[PDB]
Amino acid sequence: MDDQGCPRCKTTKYRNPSLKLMVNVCGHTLCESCVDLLFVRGAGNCPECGTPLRKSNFRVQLFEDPTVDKEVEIRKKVLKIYNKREEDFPSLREYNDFLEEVEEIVFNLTNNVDLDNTKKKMEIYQKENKDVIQKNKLKLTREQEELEEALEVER
Amino acid sequence: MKLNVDGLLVYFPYDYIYPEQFSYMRELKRTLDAKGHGVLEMPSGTGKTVSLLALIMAYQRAYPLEVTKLIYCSRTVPEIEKVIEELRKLLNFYEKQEGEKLPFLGLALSSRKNLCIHPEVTPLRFGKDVDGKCHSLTASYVRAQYQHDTSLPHCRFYEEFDAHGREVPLPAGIYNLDDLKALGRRQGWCPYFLARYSILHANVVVYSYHYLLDPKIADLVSKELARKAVVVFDEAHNIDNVCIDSMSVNLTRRTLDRCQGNLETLQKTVLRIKETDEQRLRDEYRRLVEGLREASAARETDAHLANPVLPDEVLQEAVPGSIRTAEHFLGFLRRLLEYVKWRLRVQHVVQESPPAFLSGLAQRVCIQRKPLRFCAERLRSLLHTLEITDLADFSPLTLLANFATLVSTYAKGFTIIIEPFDDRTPTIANPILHFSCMDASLAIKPVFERFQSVIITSGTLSPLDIYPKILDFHPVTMATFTMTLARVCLCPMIIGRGNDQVAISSKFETREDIAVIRNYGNLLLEMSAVVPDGIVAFFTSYQYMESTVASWYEQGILENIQRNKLLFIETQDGAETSVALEKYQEACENGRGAILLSVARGKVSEGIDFVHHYGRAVIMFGVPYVYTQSRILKARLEYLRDQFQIRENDFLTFDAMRHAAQCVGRAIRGKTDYGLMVFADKRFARGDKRGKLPRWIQEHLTDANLNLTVDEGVQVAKYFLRQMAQPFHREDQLGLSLLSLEQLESEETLKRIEQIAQQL
Amino acid sequence: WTRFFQSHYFHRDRLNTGSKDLFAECAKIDEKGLKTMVSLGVKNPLLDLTALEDKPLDEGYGISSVPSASNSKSIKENSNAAIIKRFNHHSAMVLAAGLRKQPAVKRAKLQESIEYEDLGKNNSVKTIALNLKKSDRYYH
Numbered sequence A: 001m002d003d004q005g006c007p008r009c010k011t012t013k014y015r016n017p018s019l020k021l022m023v024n025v026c027g028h029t030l031c032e033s034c035v036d037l038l039f040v041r042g043a044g045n046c047p048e049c050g051t052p053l054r055k056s057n058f059r060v061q062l063f064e065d066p067t068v069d070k071e072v073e074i075r076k077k078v079l080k081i082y083n084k085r086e087e088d089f090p091s092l093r094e095y096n097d098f099l100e101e102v103e104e105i106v107f108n109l110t111n112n113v114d115l116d117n118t119k120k121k122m123e124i125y126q127k128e129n130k131d132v133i134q135k136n137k138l139k140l141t142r143e144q145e146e147l148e149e150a151l152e153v154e155r
Numbered sequence B: 001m002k003l004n005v006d007g008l009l010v011y012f013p014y015d016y017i018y019p020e021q022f023s024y025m026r027e028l029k030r031t032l033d034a035k036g037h038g039v040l041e042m043p044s045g046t047g048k049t050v051s052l053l054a055l056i057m058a059y060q061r062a063y064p065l066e067v068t069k070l071i072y073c074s075r076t077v078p079e080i081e082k083v084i085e086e087l088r089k090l091l092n093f094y095e096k097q098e099g100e101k102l103p104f105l106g107l108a109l110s111s112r113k114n115l116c117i118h119p120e121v122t123p124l125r126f127g128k129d130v131d132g133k134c135h136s137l138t139a140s141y142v143r144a145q146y147q148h149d150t151s152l153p154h155c156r157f158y159e160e161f162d163a164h165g166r167e168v169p170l171p172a173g174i175y176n177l178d179d180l181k182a183l184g185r186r187q188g189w190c191p192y193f194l195a196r197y198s199i200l201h202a203n204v205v206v207y208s209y210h211y212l213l214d215p216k217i218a219d220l221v222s223k224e225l226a227r228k229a230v231v232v233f234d235e236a237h238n239i240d241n242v243c244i245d246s247m248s249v250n251l252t253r254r255t256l257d258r259c260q261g262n263l264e265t266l267q268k269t270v271l272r273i274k275e276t277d278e279q280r281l282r283d284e285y286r287r288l289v290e291g292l293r294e295a296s297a298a299r300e301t302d303a304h305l306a307n308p309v310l311p312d313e314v315l316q317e318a319v320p321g322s323i324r325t326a327e328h329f330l331g332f333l334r335r336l337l338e339y340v341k342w343r344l345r346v347q348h349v350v351q352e353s354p355p356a357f358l359s360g361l362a363q364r365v366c367i368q369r370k371p372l373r374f375c376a377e378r379l380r381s382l383l384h385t386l387e388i389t390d391l392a393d394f395s396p397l398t399l400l401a402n403f404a405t406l407v408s409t410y411a412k413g414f415t416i417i418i419e420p421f422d423d424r425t426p427t428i429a430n431p432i433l434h435f436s437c438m439d440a441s442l443a444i445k446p447v448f449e450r451f452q453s454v455i456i457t458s459g460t461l462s463p464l465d466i467y468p469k470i471l472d473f474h475p476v477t478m479a480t481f482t483m484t485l486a487r488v489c490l491c492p493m494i495i496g497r498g499n500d501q502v503a504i505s506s507k508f509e510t511r512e513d514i515a516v517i518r519n520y521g522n523l524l525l526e527m528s529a530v531v532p533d534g535i536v537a538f539f540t541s542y543q544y545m546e547s548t549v550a551s552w553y554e555q556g557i558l559e560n561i562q563r564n565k566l567l568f569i570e571t572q573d574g575a576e577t578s579v580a581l582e583k584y585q586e587a588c589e590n591g592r593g594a595i596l597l598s599v600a601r602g603k604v605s606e607g608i609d610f611v612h613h614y615g616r617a618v619i620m621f622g623v624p625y626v627y628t629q630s631r632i633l634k635a636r637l638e639y640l641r642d643q644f645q646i647r648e649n650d651f652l653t654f655d656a657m658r659h660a661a662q663c664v665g666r667a668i669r670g671k672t673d674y675g676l677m678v679f680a681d682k683r684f685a686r687g688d689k690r691g692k693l694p695r696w697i698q699e700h701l702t703d704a705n706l707n708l709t710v711d712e713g714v715q716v717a718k719y720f721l722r723q724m725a726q727p728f729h730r731e732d733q734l735g736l737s738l739l740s741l742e743q744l745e746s747e748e749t750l751k752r753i754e755q756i757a758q759q760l
Numbered sequence C: 001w002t003r004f005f006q007s008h009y010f011h012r013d014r015l016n017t018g019s020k021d022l023f024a025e026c027a028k029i030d031e032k033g034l035k036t037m038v039s040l041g042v043k044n045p046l047l048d049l050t051a052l053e054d055k056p057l058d059e060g061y062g063i064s065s066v067p068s069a070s071n072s073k074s075i076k077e078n079s080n081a082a083i084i085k086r087f088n089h090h091s092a093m094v095l096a097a098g099l100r101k102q103p104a105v106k107r108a109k110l111q112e113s114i115e116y117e118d119l120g121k122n123n124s125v126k127t128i129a130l131n132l133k134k135s136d137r138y139y140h
């Protein structure tokens, strides 16, 4: 409806609105017809960007902006290991500082060298593995269920 | 004229009292003595304002201990003008009676549109232009710049007011907009900013409902003043509609497309502007990390941005999560935008609860409620920080941020609706969202909490029993007042039966039924020959009006109507509205006669009063039911069934009846005024609907005039016109319906007026 | 006379389908010297319901969604709009032939609605009392 078309093949936008964009780490828009083309040959690299990709490396993501597509996947990947709550901080200010640091990590993971990011990922991951990585995931997952329960009850 | 009401002396400024006033002033006094809110359905045809203003001045004069200030408000500026001028007569007698021995400050208030003097902003045609340009001419950055380099663009009137208007209290007196403009012209000060500052010192002030109902629009009275202040409202039934309207928000894909371009422009601007300045950017983070960041608020009180529509409790002094960084904040806005665009891509109408939408956001974009609550706070700070000038162009981005803040804040009681097309485009995709808030009471809640007594005074609402339920309100008094007249001014009748015996109505879900349209054309044609001067026709819907007119033109009926009176058809174009009303009003005064036709819902029923010769007859075609937009209506209706247990059919009746009462209520404003009123719908004959009309109007809606034939109405009209076209002068009014000072000094006035009040 | 029933003069269509020219065909450009570049003569005292609400400051600020979209325009509506525009323009233009637009219009509408003949503003005569001198003249 709003997207004018993919640089690789745009006929799908004019053909029908039911098809969805396929996201890649390349941060480059591709679509279902391109998926078939990459499976038969050159599955290891992007058709024009040349960036290497593990086979299709295609995932359904309907945002029009590939940066949001990439950032949302970065969001989950980053959040999955940065589940620290304000509970882990003495104040919302220090919590927001960490949260802003995560934004830096997100932006660095989005546009900068991943050396420091990777090191920081591993260090917090290994250190907080039990509480922030696992324990917070559980509590968070419980809240997802509890929210779904409230929604179910209202339904 | 010294009028004493139950021991309180009122300095009435005219030669006579309308007997209804004393029962109303008694109840008003009683609610004020009880220091509580109240409902007083006083007919619009009475000088309810003059008496109200007089008793307030008397109550303020007699109890400055109980009442500190009066904050009146009326939906339209022309009502503000009439109130100011009617208050002038009151103050004139008070001043003549006292020799100006007591201080009094009456002050008009409005937008910069009507309170700007600066020649660069005053000629601007819309609020965007005015507010954008004025802010560009006076803002914290503009002022700081001008204060160190007076060559920089600025509004001199602000500087003059800043330099000299500040700390200079205005002398006692009533200041109308024209008065404040002249004083602003004289002293070179912004009358808009002058008014705001002076409201602290004023004794009486008149506002547009928005200043009190709208949380993002200016709120200039603190609890301290409100705690001992009286709030008075016109009984505009729209009051509940405006609460939701001041709190609801519609997002359309077109707006997002503007917001996208706007966001791109800003982000690219952030680059070049970051190269322009960066220390202030860091300073924001500093003051934000250091807490409230709230040290610019007084100069941000001099800022053309709307407030956060998060109300008092909704607002918070916490740090805006991790959206401090503008670059990350831009992404956060981008993530919401894309999610909305994706959320708006849904092929069909879908309704969500605020927690469900927030759950979807967390499910994909992972956006959290708390950071999203500080979105507008972050944006308003950023807006100033980025020094951007094009606030008008930045409006779509502002709306989205405020909407996100609202959605993230009012997580309960409200709902969202998603539609892939508009009611105007059922055939073509026009994806839109409406943040449909439903508890109108939440807008008035702070008013009832801050203010000592909120009183609603016109005679348009009925039944009064439904407003405490709807507004989740509990008044001290729930009274109504009977129109007291020696010669009636009103003959409400239900001509629900056609001459051909067709049941004239719109019961058929507004379906195409020529037989009723045909009957409507016959009635209007003959009535056009019977009613003198002008006629005002209100349709149930704009669609039906257009459909109807096309049929009458095709059937030629419309040409016979033109022969009788000049037709003036309304349209959404302000050009049409203004020209139609211009030509109609004067056509009703020139040799010819005119006949205005419009819709019972449109602004025409709101802004125009059919006083005297204007609209000597009001015709309501069909019951004004809005069966379009049923989804949003259903949602609000359902919520009313839930928290208020209000039946949809009951509410629907009320909602249409109040609109009929609006057209009728604006048909008369004085005793030397009258209005014929035809309710061309069988529905109105139901005891329930008739029973829900205003009791003072029901008095004239005698059963004998129910379901009249067209001929009966024409004959009754000719009779009613004959009976009131007869000479009946000021001296003849002293028999009944008008009491002079002699009658006021006669205790009869105290006992006779008791029966004028009504209660429900 | 037979061709006169064509369009504007008898069926009131929109564009210049008139059988005898049409400067009112551009009914938005015909109205430019009435309510666009020019204005009415009462536009402050009355007929100002275009700018009374909270919608005047900003559009999407309201819950506005009713107005004619850029999506889904129609020619059935064009016929209805033509009848409206033709009748409105005809009435407004024809009236202007007899009514140039006056500077008193706004002030007149203000005083006519602010003053009440019930509470004040009397009406009194100003003939002259006829006191005859030497009425005997008529007696004789």
Ligand code: SF4
Residues within 6 Å of the ligand: B112, B115, B116, B117, B118, B121, B122, B134, B137, B138, B155, B156, B157, B158, B189, B190, B191, B192, B193
């Ligand atoms: S500063 Fe005052 S005079 Fe100047 S544009 Fe603003 S409101 Fe008008």
Ligand SMILES: [Zn+2]
Residues within 6 Å of the ligand: A006, A007, A008, A009, A010, A012, A030, A031, A032, A033, A034
């Ligand atoms: Zn493609």
Ligand SMILES: [Zn+2]
Residues within 6 Å of the ligand: A026, A027, A028, A029, A046, A047, A048, A049, A050, A051
């Ligand atoms: Zn690529």
